[PDB]
Amino acid sequence: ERRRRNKMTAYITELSDMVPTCSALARKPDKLTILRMAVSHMKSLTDQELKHLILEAADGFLFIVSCETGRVVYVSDSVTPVLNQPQSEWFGSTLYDQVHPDDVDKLREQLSTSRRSFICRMRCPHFVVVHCTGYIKAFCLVAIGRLQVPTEFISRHNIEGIFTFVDHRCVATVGYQPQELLGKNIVEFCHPEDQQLLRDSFQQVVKLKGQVLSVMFRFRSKTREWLWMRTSSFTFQNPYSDEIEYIICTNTNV
Amino acid sequence: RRSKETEVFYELAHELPLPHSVSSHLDKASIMRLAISFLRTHKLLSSVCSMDNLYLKALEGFIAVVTQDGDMIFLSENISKFMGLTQVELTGHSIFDFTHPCDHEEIRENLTLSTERDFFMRMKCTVGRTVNLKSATWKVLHCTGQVRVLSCLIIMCEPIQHPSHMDIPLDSKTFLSRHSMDMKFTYCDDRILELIGYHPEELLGRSAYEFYHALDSENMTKSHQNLCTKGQVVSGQYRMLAKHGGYVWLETQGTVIYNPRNLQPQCIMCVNYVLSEIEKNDVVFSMDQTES
Numbered sequence: 001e002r003r004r005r006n007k008m009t010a011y012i013t014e015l016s017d018m019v020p021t022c023s024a025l026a027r028k029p030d031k032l033t034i035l036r037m038a039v040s041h042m043k044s045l046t047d048q049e050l051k052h053l054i055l056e057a058a059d060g061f062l063f064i065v066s067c068e069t070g071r072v073v074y075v076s077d078s079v080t081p082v083l084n085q086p087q088s089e090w091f092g093s094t095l096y097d098q099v100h101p102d103d104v105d106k107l108r109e110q111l112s113t114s115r116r117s118f119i120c121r122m123r124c125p126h127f128v129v130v131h132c133t134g135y136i137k138a139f140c141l142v143a144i145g146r147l148q149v150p151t152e153f154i155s156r157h158n159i160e161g162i163f164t165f166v167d168h169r170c171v172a173t174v175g176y177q178p179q180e181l182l183g184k185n186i187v188e189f190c191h192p193e194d195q196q197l198l199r200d201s202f203q204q205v206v207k208l209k210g211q212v213l214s215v216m217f218r219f220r221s222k223t224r225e226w227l228w229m230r231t232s233s234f235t236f237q238n239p240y241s242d243e244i245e246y247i248i249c250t251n252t253n254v
Numbered sequence: 255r256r257s258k259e260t261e262v263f264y265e266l267a268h269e270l271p272l273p274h275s276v277s278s279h280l281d282k283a284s285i286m287r288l289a290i291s292f293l294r295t296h297k298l299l300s301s302v303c304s305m306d307n308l309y310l311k312a313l314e315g316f317i318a319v320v321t322q323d324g325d326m327i328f329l330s331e332n333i334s335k336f337m338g339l340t341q342v343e344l345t346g347h348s349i350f351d352f353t354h355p356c357d358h359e360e361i362r363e364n365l366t367l368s369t370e371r372d373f374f375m376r377m378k379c380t381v382g383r384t385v386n387l388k389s390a391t392w393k394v395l396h397c398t399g400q401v402r403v404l405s406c407l408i409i410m411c412e413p414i415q416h417p418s419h420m421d422i423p424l425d426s427k428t429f430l431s432r433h434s435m436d437m438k439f440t441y442c443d444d445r446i447l448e449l450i451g452y453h454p455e456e457l458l459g460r461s462a463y464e465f466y467h468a469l470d471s472e473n474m475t476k477s478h479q480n481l482c483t484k485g486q487v488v489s490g491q492y493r494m495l496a497k498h499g500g501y502v503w504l505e506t507q508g509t510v511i512y513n514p515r516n517l518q519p520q521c522i523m524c525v526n527y528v529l530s531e532i533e534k535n536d537v538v539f540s541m542d543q544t545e546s
């Protein structure tokens with residue numbers, strides 16, 4: 001029934017020692033005295049340090065904007081560590097001025113006829129994604145803004161080898177516009193000699209699901225030049241069903 | 255003598271930086287817990303710094319500070335708003351006593367040893383509104399913060415919001431969609447078309463993975479995994495391929511929704527926030543974009 005007692009005493013020790021003007025004693029006082037000591041000391045002592053709590057956990061800053069003009073009524077200095085921006089810049093300013101041009105319409109609708117939240121790119125022509133979260137108050141928005149976050153080319157295939165995706169770098173790599181590979185099977189750009197080598201390779205990647213396999217072969221460039229290439233690839237399986245979405249390859253000139 | 259004791263306790267309780275509204279209603283133990291944890295908080299804050307209905311209300315989530323042994327030294331007030339549970343009820347207690355175990359290891363891994371932390375955890379929720387801890391429910395929190403030295407976790411726990419029960423307005427740059435557990439499109443609204451170029455009719459057979467930039471697939475994988483295990487996710491920023499050349503950037507919050515009378519999963523509902531315009535218009539990435 002009484003380990004209540006011993007962490008009440010643990011409480012009294014632990015507590016007693018972070019009261020400094022009490023910690024500073026060779027002998028340490030009784031129950032009530034340690035208590036009133038803490039009391040009077042607390043009195044001696046949650047406000048803007050809250051603001052920095054925000055800045056530390058969330059990487060965020062406070063700002064109020066009139067829903068009328070979009071002009072910034074108030075901006076927390078925490079804007080500076082976040083956006084690398086002087087409070088100056090945000091006081092004579094409108095929030096539309098502070099975002100990406102394409103982010104404007106969205107903003108018009110968050111400032112229209114409750115409580116608000118949205119994502120937008122704010123400048124520090126360099127922008128960063130920012131999550132603003134706030135609410136409307138007497139006609140204004142009190143919200144907080146928060147941050148977070150060629151040699152070769154990648155492709156994707158259905159299991160048969162048809163190109164289903166290529167990164168634009170393909171054009172530099174093999175001379176082809178994406179359009180010229182997409183839809184066609186990869187073994188068609190292959191030297192007949194190496195075609196079996198390519199085929200069997202697909203087998204191995206599918207038979208063994210998830211791990212990576214490499215193969216080297218001659219790939220038909222757009223100037224029709226056989227290109228030694230290593231491609232190394234693995235299947236991509238749905239997280240829920242674990243059946244096979246497709247195959248991902250990286251094709252690197254060798 | 256306990257006359258003096260009890261009365262000094264309550265006196266103490268009163269001008270902790272809180273309303274006597276709640277100060278009043280404390281067992282001495284709570285006064286202790288809170289006293290200490292309040293001190294510890296002021297310390298750690300001194301460690302990092304070398305009228306606030308605004309910051310509290312502006313937030314759509316709350317601040318937690320949690321030691322390495324998992325005891326939650328500090329929690330902002332408005333947690334009650336999101337979690338039901340009051341600060342009072344919680345400071346000093348082990349995070350692990352209020353989190354879905356199965357999330358505990360992962361919590362342990364984000365508790366220790368880059369200092370940037372970003373993960374999802376299920377926490378006990380008791381909210382129409384308020385219930386009691388008996389039939390508590392699991393609520394998913396997106397937690398982002400920094401770990402610090404001691405060892406110490408400072409995070410912001412953001413609820414993800416359940417699409418059928420909104421509290422915020424939505425934009426023109428935001429479309430909404432439904433999926434099988436496969437993330438196969440089963441439904442999408444007709445904001446798609448204006449935003450990325452597809453008719454909703456087009457996507458029905460299609461798994462969502464068909465439309466991610468390869469560079470994002472795995473990240474998406476992570477999200478999927480989590481959506482299923484935990485029940486909700488916010489994805490990172492990722493590109494979705496547009497009806498013709500190029501892509502737009504996105505962020506999707508996914509919620510598994512349940513059959514109410516069946517208590518089985520049904521679908522995934524996705525609030526999809528479009529973050530940009532089609533970036534590469536000249537560039538074609540997939541088979542569908544080649545047509546026409």
Ligand SMILES: Nc1ccc2cc3ccc(N)cc3nc2c1
Pocket residue numbers: 121129491503529530
């Ligand atoms: N709307 C967005 C969102 C995220 C973005 C991320 C980027 C990363 C690198 C880069 N060069 C441009 C980016 N543009 C973005 C535009």
